[PDB]
Amino acid sequence: MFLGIRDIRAAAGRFALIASVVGLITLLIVMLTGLTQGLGKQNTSAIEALAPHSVVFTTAGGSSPEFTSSEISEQQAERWKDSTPLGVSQTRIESDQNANTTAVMGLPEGTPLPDSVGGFIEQGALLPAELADFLHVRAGDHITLGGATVTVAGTVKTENYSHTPVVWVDTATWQLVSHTKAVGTVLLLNQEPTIQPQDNEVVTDLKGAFQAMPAYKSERSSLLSMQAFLYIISALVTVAFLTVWTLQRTRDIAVLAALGASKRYLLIDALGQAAIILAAGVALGAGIGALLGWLIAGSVPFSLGWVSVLGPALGIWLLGLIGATIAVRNVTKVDPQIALG
Amino acid sequence: MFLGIRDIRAAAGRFALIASVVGLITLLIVMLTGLTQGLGKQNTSAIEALAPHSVVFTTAGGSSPEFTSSEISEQQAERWKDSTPLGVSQTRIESDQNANTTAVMGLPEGTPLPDSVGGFIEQGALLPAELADFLHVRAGDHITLGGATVTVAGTVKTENYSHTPVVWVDTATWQLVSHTKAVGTVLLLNQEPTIQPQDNEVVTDLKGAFQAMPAYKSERSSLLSMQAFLYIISALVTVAFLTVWTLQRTRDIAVLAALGASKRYLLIDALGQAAIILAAGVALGAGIGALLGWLIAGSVPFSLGWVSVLGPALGIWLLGLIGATIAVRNVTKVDPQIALGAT
Amino acid sequence: AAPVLSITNASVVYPDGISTVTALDSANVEIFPGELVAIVGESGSGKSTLLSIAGFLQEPTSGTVTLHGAEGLDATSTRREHIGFVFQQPNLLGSLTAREQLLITDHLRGIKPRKDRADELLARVGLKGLGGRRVAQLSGGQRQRVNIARALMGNPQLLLADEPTSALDARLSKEIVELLRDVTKEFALATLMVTHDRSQLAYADRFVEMADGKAL
Amino acid sequence: AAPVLSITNASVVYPDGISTVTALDSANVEIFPGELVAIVGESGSGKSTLLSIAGFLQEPTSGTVTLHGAEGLDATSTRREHIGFVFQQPNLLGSLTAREQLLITDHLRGIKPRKDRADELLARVGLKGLGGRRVAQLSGGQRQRVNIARALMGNPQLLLADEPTSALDARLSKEIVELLRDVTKEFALATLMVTHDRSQLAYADRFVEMADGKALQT
Numbered sequence A: 001m002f003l004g005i006r007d008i009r010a011a012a013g014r015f016a017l018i019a020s021v022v023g024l025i026t027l028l029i030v031m032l033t034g035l036t037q038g039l040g041k042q043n044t045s046a047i048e049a050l051a052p053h054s055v056v057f058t059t060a061g062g063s064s065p066e067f068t069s070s071e072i073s074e075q076q077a078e079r080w081k082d083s084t085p086l087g088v089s090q091t092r093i094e095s096d097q098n099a100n101t102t103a104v105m106g107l108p109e110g111t112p113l114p115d116s117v118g119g120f121i122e123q124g125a126l127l128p129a130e131l132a133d134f135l136h137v138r139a140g141d142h143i144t145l146g147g148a149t150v151t152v153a154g155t156v157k158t159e160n161y162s163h164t165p166v167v168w169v170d171t172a173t174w175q176l177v178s179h180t181k182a183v184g185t186v187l188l189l190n191q192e193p194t195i196q197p198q199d200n201e202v203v204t205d206l207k208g209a210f211q212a213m214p215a216y217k218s219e220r221s222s223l224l225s226m227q228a229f230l231y232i233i234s235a236l237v238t239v240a241f242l243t244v245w246t247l248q249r250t251r252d253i254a255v256l257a258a259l260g261a262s263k264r265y266l267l268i269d270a271l272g273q274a275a276i277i278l279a280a281g282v283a284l285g286a287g288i289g290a291l292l293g294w295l296i297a298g299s300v301p302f303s304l305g306w307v308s309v310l311g312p313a314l315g316i317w318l319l320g321l322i323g324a325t326i327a328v329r330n331v332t333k334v335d336p337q338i339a340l341g
Numbered sequence B: 001m002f003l004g005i006r007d008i009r010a011a012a013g014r015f016a017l018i019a020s021v022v023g024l025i026t027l028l029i030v031m032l033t034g035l036t037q038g039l040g041k042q043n044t045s046a047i048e049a050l051a052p053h054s055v056v057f058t059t060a061g062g063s064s065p066e067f068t069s070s071e072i073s074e075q076q077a078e079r080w081k082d083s084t085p086l087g088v089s090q091t092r093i094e095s096d097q098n099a100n101t102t103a104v105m106g107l108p109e110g111t112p113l114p115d116s117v118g119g120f121i122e123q124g125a126l127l128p129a130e131l132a133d134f135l136h137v138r139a140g141d142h143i144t145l146g147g148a149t150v151t152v153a154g155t156v157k158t159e160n161y162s163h164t165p166v167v168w169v170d171t172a173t174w175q176l177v178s179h180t181k182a183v184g185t186v187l188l189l190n191q192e193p194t195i196q197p198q199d200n201e202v203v204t205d206l207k208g209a210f211q212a213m214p215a216y217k218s219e220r221s222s223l224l225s226m227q228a229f230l231y232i233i234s235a236l237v238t239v240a241f242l243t244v245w246t247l248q249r250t251r252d253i254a255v256l257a258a259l260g261a262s263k264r265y266l267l268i269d270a271l272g273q274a275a276i277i278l279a280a281g282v283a284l285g286a287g288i289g290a291l292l293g294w295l296i297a298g299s300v301p302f303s304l305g306w307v308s309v310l311g312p313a314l315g316i317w318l319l320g321l322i323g324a325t326i327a328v329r330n331v332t333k334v335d336p337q338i339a340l341g342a343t
Numbered sequence C: 001a002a003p004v005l006s007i008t009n010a011s012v013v014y015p016d017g018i019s020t021v022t023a024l025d026s027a028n029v030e031i032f033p034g035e036l037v038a039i040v041g042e043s044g045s046g047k048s049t050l051l052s053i054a055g056f057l058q059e060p061t062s063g064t065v066t067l068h069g070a071e072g073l074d075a076t077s078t079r080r081e082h083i084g085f086v087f088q089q090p091n092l093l094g095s096l097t098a099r100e101q102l103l104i105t106d107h108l109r110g111i112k113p114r115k116d117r118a119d120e121l122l123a124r125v126g127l128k129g130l131g132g133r134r135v136a137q138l139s140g141g142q143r144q145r146v147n148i149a150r151a152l153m154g155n156p157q158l159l160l161a162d163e164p165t166s167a168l169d170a171r172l173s174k175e176i177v178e179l180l181r182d183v184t185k186e187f188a189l190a191t192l193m194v195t196h197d198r199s200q201l202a203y204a205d206r207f208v209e210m211a212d213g214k215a216l
Numbered sequence D: 001a002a003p004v005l006s007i008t009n010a011s012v013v014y015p016d017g018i019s020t021v022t023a024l025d026s027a028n029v030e031i032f033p034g035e036l037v038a039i040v041g042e043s044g045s046g047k048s049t050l051l052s053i054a055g056f057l058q059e060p061t062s063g064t065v066t067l068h069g070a071e072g073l074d075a076t077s078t079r080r081e082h083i084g085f086v087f088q089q090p091n092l093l094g095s096l097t098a099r100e101q102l103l104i105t106d107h108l109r110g111i112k113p114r115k116d117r118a119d120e121l122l123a124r125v126g127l128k129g130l131g132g133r134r135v136a137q138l139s140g141g142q143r144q145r146v147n148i149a150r151a152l153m154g155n156p157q158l159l160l161a162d163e164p165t166s167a168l169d170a171r172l173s174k175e176i177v178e179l180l181r182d183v184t185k186e187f188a189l190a191t192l193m194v195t196h197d198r199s200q201l202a203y204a205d206r207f208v209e210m211a212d213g214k215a216l217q218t
Ligand code: HEM
Pocket: A162, A163, A214, A215, A218, A219, A222, A223, A300, A301, B162, B163, B215, B218, B219, B222, B223, B300, B301
């Protein structure tokens, strides 16, 4: 570890070029990670907030359940006991001052809302605080919701469904706004189902309930695949560079071997140098990453925590260490007679 | 170029490692490039087919125009002459056998649709053939569209708006499905705008009209930004690798220099070796890229042409050549006396 | 009254391309504390091969080499604790300073680097106060002087010098051999010195002549 | 009566760390076609410095070095067209075959590599039919023989050999010096040969003794 650290001091140029490349890849991975979690919460934050155990859908032609095509009839709701019908629709909201499209969720009156949202289901529509400010609307003003005039029951926090904020209304109001005789679009089960489902019914877990959303799986999967390739590319970049680099030190490594340096010493030296270089690159990339993400989290959906920046960072660094040992393996095979020539 | 090409033949191992990294990065870039172009048409393919010259929006509080908030009043439409009202909404479609949500575009009755889409605006809704197959609905069957039962007037080609297929209906029908007395959401202008707009009105070109789409700008920009990082990462990877590599040949380069090899020869030798490696890496990476993309373009939106695979591929290869020359610059600065002694 | 190194009937055979070549042929050499034994002979007579054998840099293909006080130790551990190498080229690590060239041997031996000892030895080799010089600030003779000091850092009982005056003029090469002989006597080292300049035999206690891998 | 190479009062001073160093001090040497001139002296006396000067590998800090027939040419162009180097180490490129070690010189000279000449020369150096061997399959003597052949590919006027017998036993080193003498005479080459072995001066027409960068001459 003695020579390795001082090689870096005296040749900071060469390592800066490579460390920047490692830093860029970590920057891309850290920011891609935050964007995938941000988009994931943009689609699931509302359903996840409600924290159901199982979710009953309705299908056609035995196809996979879809939130865009499922409806729960009143009798279907009475079948599943200890369950509440949830209506999920997206429609146009229009105020006296502005308008936009938003998601509308409907639940039975009096159902307590998750602490993420707080309050309880009231008669009428509960608007997200940001949406009420956008429309220049206050509590008690009339608004056109899906072609029907509804009274704003109050303001609430913002949750999301399919990249839209969730407007919370009573089950009766949702039926008028979504033009359906059904009591809901899905059935939320908080306990484990003790009844067997019908031919047209299907029970699903919270995870699988997200896959019933159109954009979620087909867009998170593609983002995850990019992350997997990026982790692989980082590992190969380190291995590719470090193999060629360790070959450059053969002469200095041979001299230490001739002097009596054990194989353990030479391997620790090489891996120590790589670990410091990889640490610098990853720290700078993840540092710049969290900063750019926080700077961008206003224009683009970006979820930024400690695990979403440092999780990938530590993963990349450990991938680099595994890659580095693979590249430094040949430091112990250097014949010490290379120094006598 | 003599030594450079034969170095690769006899030591194919190390070059395979680096060429794989270059191929992987090109693989990632090729699909990201195609995916950004594919999603762009997924948001704009319908409007692009109509090919308007200018587009008039409606705003509130002088904010940026948004397709989710624009409506054109009937008298407002009479002001701008030589204009066609376009209604754009997304709502739920339900058939006797199935249902789903889709985008609905409305135009005045009888207006001929662009040859991209063909047919004419008829009373009722013209459904995409693929959606009708999913719903098990034929010509003459009743379907529930946004809470209203409408008869299928006929089939048309498939265009997309906000990741949804476009159902084409007459201006009257669209009002019923969108629950509005307005005659449309935007106005398509085929001629030059000769009327001045009001403080609350805004005319925009076809490109700027896409910014009024919610997902388009915020998602194409992010995809393009990722591609920019990938191009930079590719260039840096080659420069980083090639600098250390050329330092490895100092001894062999010195021997050729000592023998009398000109500076051009050593530099041409070095760049020839690098160019061959970059070509191999990019060709193999872009090859697997187009293959996986065509294989996947059925489940995920992926636009795959010749320019969308070879444009970026050739760009990366040229970026690599620029990086390589920067890294091989020191091949001509090696003194041949390194060969007379020991190193 | 006790030898440091004993090479008994040692021979080395390297695979010269497709065939084999006998480099060292039944070498017999024994060195006692305080001796400077030179190895003379033309280029390619087996001098370097004998040196590498004496430094445990390669085992002989036949015969045995015993360094007393290091019995029961692998080849590498023997070099680290009992042998100091004065390579033909100074073999100074580029990124280290003159003083650091000594400390790194202490570090690879697992002891806290001794700055005072390094400066004392650098002064003993006639580089007092130059511990801070880098390789770019060292002359040919100075680098060779640092090399000698590095061989002395671990306090070995066997000092092996491989033509350490090959890139030095007559004046400078005298100083290095005088330094080598003086250090050999002062620290009771057993030193093998390979050289082709027969003008340096006057400073050696004994010499071995070599031809075609056979010692005379 | 017409020298190929003329080193007149040539001197080289390298920067030896903080100070400088006169590696060659006013050397005067002339080599004529067909001569094998040995340069003898201890290690570090200025033999290699004189060789590097004669091989246009570095200009002297003072004095002039002239290769006749190549006047008006840069340093590199002179080496490519008029000099053949028998380096101390064979300096064979690892990825090339025996014959390719010769052909690559033709390629760097801008001529389609001539295999016939490459094979003829390989035969003359005693490697007939070994053009397919790789460096890993070549012994010390054989690698040095390829080096001689590579120096002969370009039909040079000056052949410089830097102790080409340093890693060869007595038997092999005789063969190599004989080959150098024989090739020098057969191709009317002018050959400077630096050597530390005093046993090989018998093969040289003349010899220059050197000490501390000064050539001794009566
Ligand atoms: C701000 C950035 C982004 C935003 C706002 C966004 C928004 C959207 C929206 C709105 C949808 C359709 C869902 C709906 O309309 O309810 C969608 C689908 C999709 N997105 Fe994005 N997206 C972004 C970035 C990305 C990125 C970076 C990727 C891949 C790297 C991606 C891949 C996809 C895919 C594959 C789909 C599904 C396409 C389909 O089958 O219809 N998106 N996204």
